């Protein structure tokens, strides 16, 4: 029932921290982002990952560094994890350069192209907008697509929220829960709890009242075939 975690290392954790964009993209500085990158790096380090933090990557950078990571040897790793922090739009995250489809980023790790992650969980946490809707609230051959989990900060077609001073809500919530339960809850329990937190704990504060008092719900997509605990535990 659980993924085998009995490996030399837990695995690699790549963090892409995109804060600054070319003006031509029309995207703004994402203040709050450096906090998220730090809290995430500290958190994933605690879990046991080898965390690497990249900053302000172009789209060609983002493709290449991810392609290479899938071309490494993960034979002694229990899993792999990638965290993206950027602007986005449906199906697509921004580099500083422009826009690239998420599917192209993650496909490098399909079973048929990163054979050493075959049968192991490959996790992606994505803090990015996914279009422009606002939520108002209300009062054994293995499938090559097997074993991914994508934890998006928000549901398709919606914006995602970031506090310049405190961090994105998704990330704040995630870290918070991972700190108290990283080592003792199953991954879905963790993310369910992160769902509850982003939903219960945050509400937009804004001058423009079009953007005022909005809510958010994250969106977890699981192709996993087993339960995942981070502690051999």
């Amino acid at each position: 029932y659980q993924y085998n975690m009995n490996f030399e290392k837990l695995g690699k954790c790549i963090i892409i921290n995109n804060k600054n964009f070319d003006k031509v993209t029309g995207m703004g500085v994402r203040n709050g982002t450096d906090k998220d990158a730090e809290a995430l790096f500290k958190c994933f380090r605690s879990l046991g990952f080898d965390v690497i933090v990249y900053n302000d990557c172009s789209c060609a950078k983002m493709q290449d560094l991810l392609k290479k990571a899938s071309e490494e040897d993960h034979t002694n790793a229990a899993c792999f994890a990638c965290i993206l922090l950027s602007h986005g739009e449906e199906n697509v995250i921004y580099g500083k350069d422009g826009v690239t489809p998420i599917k192209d980023l993650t496909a490098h790790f399909r079973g048929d192209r990163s054979k050493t992650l075959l049968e192991k969980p490959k996790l992606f946490f994505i803090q990015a907008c996914r279009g422009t809707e606002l939520d108002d609230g209300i009062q054994y051959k293995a499938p090559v697509e097997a074993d991914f989990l994508f934890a998006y900060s928000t549901v398709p077609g919606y914006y995602s929220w970031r506090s310049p001073g405190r961090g994105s809500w998704f990330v704040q919530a995630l870290c918070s829960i991972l700190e108290e339960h990283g080592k003792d809850l199953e991954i879905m329990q963790i993310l369910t709890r992160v769902n509850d937190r982003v939903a219960r704990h945050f509400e937009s504060q804004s001058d423009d009242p079009h953007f005022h008092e909005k809510k958010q719900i994250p969106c977890v997509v699981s192709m996993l075939t087993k339960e995942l605990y981070f502690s051999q535990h």
Binding site: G28, R30, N31, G32, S86, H87, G88, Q127, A128, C129, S153, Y159, S160, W161, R162, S163, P164, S168, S204, Q205, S206, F211
Partner: peptide, 4 residues
């Protein structure tokens, strides 16, 4: 608060 700002949007991504």
């Amino acid at each position: 608060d700002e949007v991504x």
